[PDB]
C-alpha cells in the first residue's frame, strides 16, 4: 500500500505539472491573467487529491482518485479557451 500510494501521488503530481507546463507554454501577455488563475486552481486540485491519496486504504480507491484528479484538472482547463 505504501508503494501504491507513492505511485498514485507521483501520477497526480506529474499530470498537474504537465498541464501547468502546457498552460505556461501557451501563455501570452494577453492570456497571462488566465494562466495565473488557472495554475493556482490546478495546484489547489493537486493538493486536494494528494491529501485524499495519503489517507487512502485501498488500491482501488487510489485508482479512482487518480482518475478523479485528472478529470477535475481537465474540467478546470475547459473553463478557458484553448
Amino acid at each position: 500500500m505504501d508503494s501504491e500510494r507513492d505511485k498514485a501521488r507521483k501520477e497526480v503530481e506529474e499530470y498537474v505539472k504537465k498541464i501547468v507546463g502546457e498552460s505556461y507554454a501557451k501563455s501570452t501577455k494577453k492570456r497571462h491573467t488566465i494562466t495565473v488563475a488557472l495554475v493556482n486552481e490546478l495546484n489547489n486540485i493537486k493538493n486536494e487529491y494528494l491529501n485524499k491519496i495519503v489517507e487512502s486504504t485501498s488500491e482501488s480507491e487510489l485508482q479512482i482518485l487518480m482518475m478523479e484528479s485528472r478529470s477535475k484538472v481537465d474540467e478546470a482547463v475547459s473553463k478557458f479557451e484553448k
Binding site: 501570452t28 501577455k29 497571462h32 495554475v39 493556482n40 495546484n43 491529501n51
Partner: protein
Amino acid sequence: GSHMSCDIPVFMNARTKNDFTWFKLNDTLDYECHDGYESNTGSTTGSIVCGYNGWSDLPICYER
C-alpha cells in the same frame, strides 16, 4: 494546511535571486525577465505575493 503557504513557482524567461523554497502568506518574491523579454504589463521586473489562493501573479516573461 495547504492555504497557509505557497511553493516557489515555476519561472519562464525570468529569474529570481530569492533563495527561499516556500513562502508564508503575505511573503513576496521578486522576478526579473531575461533580456529581450517583458512581463504581461511591459515591465522587466515584478513582485508577487503569496496568498490564500496561491500566487498573486506568476514570473512569466514574454518575448518583446
